């Protein structure tokens, strides 16, 4: 069986398509002429729309630095364009013979190819979105690395001035991402792990407060332990962000 679509945005786009194709198949197998209209113009409209999707897709990938996106996108372009040729040929066939068997196989296979290809294109953009979040996550992970070198209260001011904003940006990206997913278990995982990270923030600063004043042992271990616990949670977030049923 076809898995549940990854996000709600993807779901809202492709679910009606998937549903109508299964209906077409059922109709094709259980159904029973001159009632078939000219599909030349309708197919032409699909071909036009697909062409526009390919162009916009290229212009969008043209202006990125994601070399992975540049690599994984072109196969999807090929899928949908090939599927169009099957629809064009089908319309031409049915125009000559309304009872054409290969024409009906083409209609189903071409429609399926449009879906699969558009799905690939959406999943590929989605993976690029996730990669942006992961970068932010990894940046904070590395920001926590430098918590060990803060030895003065002035340095603690500087350290806190940037950590706060970054924490807030990450929290916002994860919040926006979680309420887009169609899998509840993954949403709650992301929410909980992010909540744990946020509440460990004042704990870290407070520990760095007492460590700094002490330097100028107990606070030393407490700081490192917080960093450890925070880091483990962010890596877990990274793991869940990439969880999918589409591969």
């Amino acid at each position: 069986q076809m898995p549940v679509f990854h996000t709600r945005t993807i779901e809202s786009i492709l679910e009606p398509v998937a549903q109508q194709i299964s209906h077409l198949v059922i109709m094709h197998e259980e159904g029973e002429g001159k009632a078939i209209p000219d599909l030349t113009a309708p197919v032409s409209a699909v071909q036009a729309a697909v062409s526009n999707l390919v162009r916009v897709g290229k212009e969008t990938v043209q202006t990125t630095e994601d070399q992975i996106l540049k690599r994984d996108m072109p196969p999807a372009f090929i899928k949908v364009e090939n599927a169009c040729t099957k629809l064009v040929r089908a319309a031409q066939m049915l125009q000559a013979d309304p009872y054409s068997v290969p024409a009906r196989d083409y209609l189903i296979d071409g429609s399926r190819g449009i879906l699969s290809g558009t799905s690939d294109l959406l999943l590929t953009f989605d993976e690029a979105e996730v990669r942006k979040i992961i970068r932010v996550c990894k940046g904070i992970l590395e920001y926590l690395t430098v918590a060990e070198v803060v030895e003065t209260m002035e340095d603690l001011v500087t350290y806190t001035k940037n950590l706060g904003p970054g924490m807030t940006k990450m929290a916002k990206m994860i919040d926006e991402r979680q309420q887009e997913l169609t899998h509840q278990e993954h949403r709650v995982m992301l929410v909980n792990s992010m909540n744990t990270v946020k509440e460990l923030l004042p704990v870290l600063i407070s520990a760095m407060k007492i460590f700094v004043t002490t330097k100028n042992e107990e606070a030393l271990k407490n700081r490192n332990f917080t960093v450890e616990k925070m880091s483990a949670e962010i890596n877990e977030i990274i793991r869940v962000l990439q969880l999918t049923s589409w591969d």
């Binding site: 309708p42 897709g57 920001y143």
Partner: protein, 46 residues
């Protein structure tokens, strides 16, 4: 000797390293959805 970055320098590098076009893609996917669904509807009726 090595000119090691200060705290402020080391932080700014990390932040730099980490941290509309999506609306246009979704729009073109929906137009593709619409055209294909209209095609199947004309064929099936519906």
């Amino acid at each position: 000797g090595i000119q090691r970055p200060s705290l402020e320098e080391r932080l700014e590098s990390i932040i730099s390293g980490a941290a509309d076009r999506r609306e246009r893609i979704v729009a073109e996917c929906n137009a593709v959805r619409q055209a294909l669904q209209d095609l199947l509807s004309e064929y099936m009726g519906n």
